[PDB]
Amino acid sequence: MRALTLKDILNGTFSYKTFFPNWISGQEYLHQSADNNIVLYNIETGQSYTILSNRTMKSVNASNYGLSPDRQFVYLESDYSKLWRYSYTATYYIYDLSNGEFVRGNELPRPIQYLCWSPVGSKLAYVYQNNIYLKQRPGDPPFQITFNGRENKIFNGIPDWVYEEEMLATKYALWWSPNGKFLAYAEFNDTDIPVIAYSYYGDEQYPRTINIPYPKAGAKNPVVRIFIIDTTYPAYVGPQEVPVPAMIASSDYYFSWLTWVTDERVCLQWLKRVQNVSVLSICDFREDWQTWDCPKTQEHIEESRTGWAGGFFVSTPVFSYDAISYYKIFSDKDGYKHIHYIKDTVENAIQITSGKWEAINIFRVTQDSLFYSSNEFEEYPGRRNIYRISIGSYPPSKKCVTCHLRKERCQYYTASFSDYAKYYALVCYGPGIPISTLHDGRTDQEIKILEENKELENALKNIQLPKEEIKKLEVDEITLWYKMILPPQFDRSKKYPLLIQVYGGPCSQSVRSVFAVNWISYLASKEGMVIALVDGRGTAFQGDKLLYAVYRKLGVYEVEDQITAVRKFIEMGFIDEKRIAIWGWSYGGYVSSLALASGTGLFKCGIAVAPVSSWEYYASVYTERFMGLPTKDDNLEHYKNSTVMARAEYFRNVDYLLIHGTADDNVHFQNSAQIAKALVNAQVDFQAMWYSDQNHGLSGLSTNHLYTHMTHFLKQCFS
Amino acid sequence: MRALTLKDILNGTFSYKTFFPNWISGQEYLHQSADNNIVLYNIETGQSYTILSNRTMKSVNASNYGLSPDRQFVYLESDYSKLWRYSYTATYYIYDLSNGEFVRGNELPRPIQYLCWSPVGSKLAYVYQNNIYLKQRPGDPPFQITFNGRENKIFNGIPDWVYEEEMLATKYALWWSPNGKFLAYAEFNDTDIPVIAYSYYGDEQYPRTINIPYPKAGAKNPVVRIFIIDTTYPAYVGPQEVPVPAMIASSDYYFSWLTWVTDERVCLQWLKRVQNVSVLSICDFREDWQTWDCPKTQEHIEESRTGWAGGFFVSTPVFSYDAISYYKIFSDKDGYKHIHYIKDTVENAIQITSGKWEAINIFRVTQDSLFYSSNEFEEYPGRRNIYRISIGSYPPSKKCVTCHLRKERCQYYTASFSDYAKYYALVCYGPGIPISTLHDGRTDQEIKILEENKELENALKNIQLPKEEIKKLEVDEITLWYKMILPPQFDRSKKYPLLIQVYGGPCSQSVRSVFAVNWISYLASKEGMVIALVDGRGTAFQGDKLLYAVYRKLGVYEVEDQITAVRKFIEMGFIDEKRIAIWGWSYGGYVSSLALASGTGLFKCGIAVAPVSSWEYYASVYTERFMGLPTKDDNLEHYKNSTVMARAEYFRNVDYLLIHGTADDNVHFQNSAQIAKALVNAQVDFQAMWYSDQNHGLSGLSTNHLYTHMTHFLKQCFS
């Protein structure tokens, strides 16, 4: 009865609710009621008990909580204060469940940067002022583990900037051994890496400088040391450095992830600074020296002949119940990424998945089953169904649990498992209204709808949503998957303006069977624009040829493939060849810009939000992974060839609107500053917009402002 | 016939020349020829010769020269490198003009700040790395005066940032005594003053950070010390601090200016930080104790009971031939600034000029003559003629040299007097094409035309310029002078969009009979826009009821007076009220914003280039002068009330265009960053533009862009 309105989108009127059980055992989870009460629901009995009242929570206005594995204590986390994507500080009030009171001995210090329970019992490890601390018991005086922490120079047990956003994707870098015997932790040195400096205008009379150690392409990188201390004899034995494989130590390198096996066995993944080689390292504990031994025989190489080791990140092993063998997804001989099963050497791995489709994530490995997500089903690469396979004996049996569960509503699934995988939740994201459901571990049968989104279902019932369709184009030897969003009563005999939404980042996939009533949904609903999104070269989950196509040649095929798609769309007949725009954020901004400046005639305008503008300016770990090194005898020539600044002249005849946040710690305002300056030097008009103090996300009312500004631009561009 | 173009204005096609004799005696001046030779002209004798060859200058590719008082040497300036507005860095070679080769040996150091000769002989004084050095013969080894010089921290003989822009308005802060027996310099200590920090993106991989000790409103000011040193025997006694007057030392104080009356007499001017009182001090070298003495009987208080002490700046004294008494422009008893002759006391002063107008500048005091510029001719505040009055003889005489020199073509004059005022040059700037002429000045007779501007006179023949008109409005006891620029073939009956150019800064004057082919000319010539510039309250040269009316109420009355004017312009009947814009720069961008957010629905749109947004962010010197202090006791409340941020809401339904250069060291980008931040927080769309690495001037290819971008805006706004 009525079209989406921009305020529907910016108020989240039609957001959906998800449900990920905060497991505490094989059969129990800790949700938070509408009453704000924190309830423990036992799945087997069906009984619900409330552990942690709204009141107790409110008394320290905690925004969050954490049960100790022994249920004796629960920490309440408050004064939440954000930093980067994942990191944040908080104050922590720990609470004694048995005595129903807060714990009084030696209060924890304020701003704590990370804190977690041990995996069993109720030991604490925390990070305060860049050092790791240990508590045997909630109310004890802390034991200092590291002493050399220093505000962005040296980090213990939390990453620095580059490792947070680009390697770990995690706010922490310490891992308890399975039963708490040991803590393993990373030490990052940022001391002589260059610094990104920018202004934050804040609220005072004087702006301040913000400085983050931030290794730009080719710049000097952080150095890592991984240590493990005995958690019961930390002073007696002291921290022991995990030995680094010779073929990793021989040049710059990275730690990529750590995975515990047993308490006496740890798996370390390294990545050579030239990131086409990954090493997996399995170390065992010696008792005679109380130290770690990593034998050559337990070093596993993973190479990429024609690209980079991994997908976006290296795959991590998930180990068998036996705690010797492991499973890992990587490229097979055909260039498709599949699950392999590894006992002794990696040269001997047995491939247990295969086909022109990819194993995307291994969720769980039990005694008999392995649960994983994949795009196999009906061979749409942008779907996620979750599958199980038998692991006891060759040929694995295969069951797609999700495929036909709700065939039409749900073709994009993630999974979350309870302990021992006694039960798991399935979360379907689309194409229909998302749904979270509870499933039996042994049988796969659903035992509870968790979140059905009845409100949304019903709120959407008066709203004439745009029609999404996902399809494919074969052009050369290259196939292009595309989502097309279309206005209600899309009369094909008429010519609609087209908007291309681009991202195109290496390892991305932007064409997905996901549900989202969003901005580009609204532009079709009310504004009469056709919207399209195109996955081509460098996009993932279709094998290595397509993935690694853009290696060292960034911002070439991405541009090419978008233009191709657009050409093919205008040729479909229903697209106003005179009203095509393109808009893109981050990597999207790069390609939005390179596309619009391609001397193609196709695009009449384009928008670039927080674009990279030259790989010189972006972080090493990301850039070098795809671009290699900006040296003269590596890849400097394409580093210089691939800026948007060089396209300076080709803006003269298109509307450009260029947007950026002045406090982007990830894609630096520098990027758009250089673009703007280049347009100025080439004497080219454009529209621009800064967001003071705002960062890469463009949060709060920025977002509001952002979309209102782009909407205006866009409505202008389509007269 | 043809209308003006943006190209015309941006190219400087219709720019004009000027002729200021570079005097070297009472009858000789040096000027650079068309084919770049430096030639000595004499007007007493009418002879010329090439004092410095064309190719000797190109031998070091210098761009400036400096002939010594004894004509034995000239300085040659190459490697000019701009710091701020007046400050710059250069290389100095000395040409032995007696021998016909360069001076070798004790070669001057690289990047020297400021350099100059004595007014007698050819002794050198220069500042290198913030420290004063002194030379006896141009080839002698330098004698260091100061030692405490530190980049960005201690400044000897040159100013810190705020003293340069806001106090002294000059690259230098050293002065020779008239015969060069002594040397006076300033010590500026910036140490404890907060730095302002901004990014400079440059061309390197990482931007760098620029810091400038910059005191914003109410912050820690620089401390000043002024010293005097014997030039002949500096080894003997060393540098001597000239006493600070008791009332001045009582609290915070600036050094306003220093003038030398004789070699044993010196004038110093001080400004109490609360700038309503200033103290003129005269000091004598006492022979016995070899230091300087300032009798408190020779302290002459100038205070204001209504506003700030002085004009824009405190006015300097011009001393009569007896080297004791002086002539100084200041507020008479009725509030109009006029010349006074102070013989011995302030109360004992005799008023020399009087009436409803202002003596703007004293140019020369002779044995029997005084030359001053004035507001007087036909009650027109917007033009300046030059007046000659007798002194020392009875039947007093007043002659206006220029009032009828060229009545219709020249009403805005300045003067350049040779030594002993033997000959003077007249430069007229409007309303017609500027022209520079040479005069006798015992007789005032015009001897010849130095710069006629026939190139410009002729090039403007193809061009239909707009009709300019400076009229005035009378409204509610307060009158407002204006200049209206009208389109060619202006139809009195038709209706025209109206653009207002606004500045409004206290002590300023925007309406002037000055020839200027500039942006607004183009917009009237081609675009059909009626333009108006209005001087209201806070505007100088019409006495103190006008000038001081803005004291402590900044932004209030100036906004109000553009509104009253616009309103009157509307009821003139040829202005389309639906199409009105206002635009400004610096202060002009402050009031344009405020006028646009006036909530009076008069302006459809407005542009603010590099606006001040809150007096909290601007330099102390300028700010406190007109605002007082931002404290509990003083004016805080109105610093608080008078920002643009506070008016964010009122922007909802106007078109705002906000422009600012990210390297603006004078009005910091923080100003525009905070307006932007406010508008977002209020959910108000607007247009913005930043200029990377550009300062307050927006010079270079940035100008093109800015002026192009703005006229796209107005054009669209006036669609």
Ligand SMILES: *C1O[C@H](CO)[C@@H](O[C@@H]2O[C@H](CO)[C@@H](O)[C@H](O)[C@H]2NC(C)=O)[C@H](O)[C@H]1NC(C)=O
């Ligand atoms: C350098 O100076 C010489 C001498 O003034 C210039 O040569 C003269 O050029 C003009 C025409 O511009 C002729 O009328 C003269 O006959 C030339 N005189 C001599 C001595 O050759 C020369 O043009 C100047 N070069 C520069 C830098 O412009």
Ligand SMILES: *[C@@H]1O[C@H](CO)[C@@H](O[C@@H]2O[C@H](CO)[C@@H](O)[C@H](O)[C@H]2NC(C)=O)[C@H](O)[C@H]1NC(C)=O
């Ligand atoms: C905090 O938790 C308590 C405990 O359940 C809530 O108290 C109930 O509120 C409902 C509805 O307002 C009342 O009808 C009941 O009398 C209360 N107890 C029950 C469940 O029967 C309280 O509403 C919660 N809300 C907050 C944040 O204060």
Ligand SMILES: *[C@H]1O[C@H](CO)[C@@H](O)[C@H](O[C@@H]2O[C@H](CO)[C@@H](O)[C@H](O)[C@H]2NC(C)=O)[C@H]1NC(C)=O
């Ligand atoms: C300015 O510089 C002078 C020397 O020319 C210096 O004495 C002033 O204050 C000093 O600052 C020092 C460094 O911060 C400090 O250690 C010292 O105690 C202090 N001197 C005095 C007299 O106490 C500098 N100015 C300011 C405002 O501090």
Ligand SMILES: *[C@@H]1O[C@H](CO)[C@@H](O)[C@H](O)[C@H]1NC(C)=O
């Ligand atoms: C905003 O969101 C809430 C809940 O999603 C909804 O009830 C409300 O009607 C929405 N509309 C606005 C703009 O407030």
Ligand SMILES: *[C@@H]1O[C@H](CO)[C@@H](O)[C@H](O)[C@H]1NC(C)=O
């Ligand atoms: C951190 O790096 C610096 C400079 O490379 C070095 O001197 C210092 O010892 C390092 N600290 C360690 C090893 O934790």
Ligand SMILES: *[C@@H]1O[C@H](CO)[C@@H](O)[C@H](O)[C@H]1NC(C)=O
């Ligand atoms: C760099 O720019 C474009 C990429 O689109 C390409 O056509 C051109 O040949 C390239 N030049 C170099 C240096 O290889």
Ligand SMILES: *[C@@H]1O[C@H](CO)[C@@H](O)[C@H](O)[C@H]1NC(C)=O
């Ligand atoms: C720029 O200025 C030069 C010198 O005055 C003039 O000859 C030229 O015509 C101007 N503008 C253009 C059209 O390039």
Ligand SMILES: *[C@@H]1O[C@H](CO)[C@@H](O)[C@H](O)[C@H]1NC(C)=O
């Ligand atoms: C400024 O000076 C006046 C006298 O001219 C005095 O009344 C006042 O105290 C000063 N300003 C303040 C602090 O109000």
Ligand SMILES: *[C@H]1O[C@H](CO)[C@@H](O)[C@H](O)[C@H]1NC(C)=O
């Ligand atoms: C990366 O390792 C490969 C092995 O596939 C090797 O040939 C190559 O020299 C290395 N560097 C790159 C990026 O070429």
